[PDB]
Amino acid sequence: PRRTVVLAIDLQAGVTPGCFDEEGVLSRAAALVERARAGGVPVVWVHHDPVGVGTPEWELAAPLHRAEGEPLVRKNYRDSFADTTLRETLDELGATHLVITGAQSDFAVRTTMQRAAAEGYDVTLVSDAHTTVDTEWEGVRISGEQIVAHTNMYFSGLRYPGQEFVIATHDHVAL
Amino acid sequence: PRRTVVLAIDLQAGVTPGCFDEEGVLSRAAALVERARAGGVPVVWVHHDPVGVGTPEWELAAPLHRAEGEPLVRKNYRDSFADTTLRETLDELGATHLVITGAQSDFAVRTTMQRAAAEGYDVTLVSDAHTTVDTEWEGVRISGEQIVAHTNMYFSGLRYPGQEFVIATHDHVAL
Ligand SMILES: O=C1N[C@H]2C=C[C@@H]1C2
Ligand SMILES: O=C1N[C@H]2C=C[C@@H]1C2
């Protein structure tokens, strides 16, 4: 029996500023979480401790708010499963299918969504609810917008035997 | 005791044409494999069967050649560990550290290098020995060159507790 969990990664006040389409992405993430709550779909929050434990930057970016009962997993690396309670938290919920929203597309989101796939989960990436910042390397620029687009392209074709991957918008993903 | 293995992914005649800097990348991959052979470092080849088993497109792109004794792992998905003999092949070699060259940067290479990291390997990505093609999604273009650059940027900062990740060129990586 499929149980869906929404996994909201590093949507922290110190992470999202300057990200591509920041206000819109935060707005659609919020809408997604509301829809999950209305559907009785569990929401699990992941926070990156190196943002600065105890500082305002570590807390959820506005307008996101955690509800009573919703687990919060703290991590120190890009992979939300690495040395964390995430797997235990998910197993306790009987999770089989993760619906992923968060930041940043190319770091925590990238590394966590691929780890989840490797672990055997069905994964749905919410195409209009993740973001990152402009960057450059080796003398070429790559915008946040380009990284978001390329991420959605990558995920749309991801396949593992016996597993299901879906790319879907915040208001069409099945909850 | 660290044992290094060079892992050469999908450098196939049907995969590399049209890739960014194709001739140069193939040349540096070849040089890397030669250096590994001279150093007694094992080389493991991975081929993507969906390229077309039994067709010329499935074979190694020129000027690459497999030597006697070098394992060849066949796969059907982006992740070279998914339903393959790769883990068994690596375990038989006592591999602890994988040096990765191949194509395409954003598909087989991306998915395999991250899976290797998740499995607990030390991984070195060879910065000037992987490539992919131009693409576009959501109305924005992202070049092969941009994807290669962004991949190297990503890998340069990848961290897992107790594991080591290095980004290094084909002629400086330690063999
Ligand atoms: O994706 C990310 N989440 C935080 C840690 C690495 C980046 C900032
Ligand atoms: O990276 C890749 N290797 C082959 C399968 C998917 C792409 C072509």
Rounded to a whole number of angstroms, the distance from the CA of A105 to the nearest CA of chain B is: 11
Q: B131-134: which pairs have CB atoms within 8 A and are 24 or more residues apart?
A: B131/B16, B131/B19, B131/B20, B131/B21, B131/B22, B131/B25, B131/B103, B131/B104, B131/B105, B132/B19, B132/B20, B132/B103, B132/B104, B132/B105, B132/B106, B132/B107, B133/B18, B133/B19, B133/B20, B133/B104, B134/B20
Q: How far apart are the CA of A159 and the centre of ligand 2, in A?
A: 12
Structural method: X-ray
Task: Pick the residue of B21, B138, B143, B153 with the most A CBs within 10 A to test the interface with A by mutation.
Answer: B138
Buried b (16+ CB within 10 A) or exposed e, A108-133: bbbbbbbbbbbeebbbbbbbbbbbbb
Q: For the stretch A62-91, what's the b/e string if a residue is b when 16 or more beta carbons lie within 10 angstroms of its beta carbon? A: eebeeeeebbebebebbbbbbebebeebbe
Q: Which two tokens stand for residue B17?
A: 């044409």
Ligand 1 contact via A110 beta carbon (within 6 Å): no
Q: What resolution (Å)?
A: 1.8
Q: Where are the beta strands (DSSP E) in chain B?
A: 4-9, 43-48, 72-75, 97-103, 122-131, 135-137, 140-142, 165-168
Residue B150: partners with Cβ closer than 8 Å, 6 or more residues away: A106, A135, A137, A142, A147, A150
Q: Which of A135, A146, A150 sits opposite B106 (nearest CB)?
A: A150
Task: Return the closest-CA partner of residue A115 out of A79, A140, A167.
Answer: A79
Whether A107 is in the pocket of ligand 1, judged by its Cβ within 6 Å, is yes
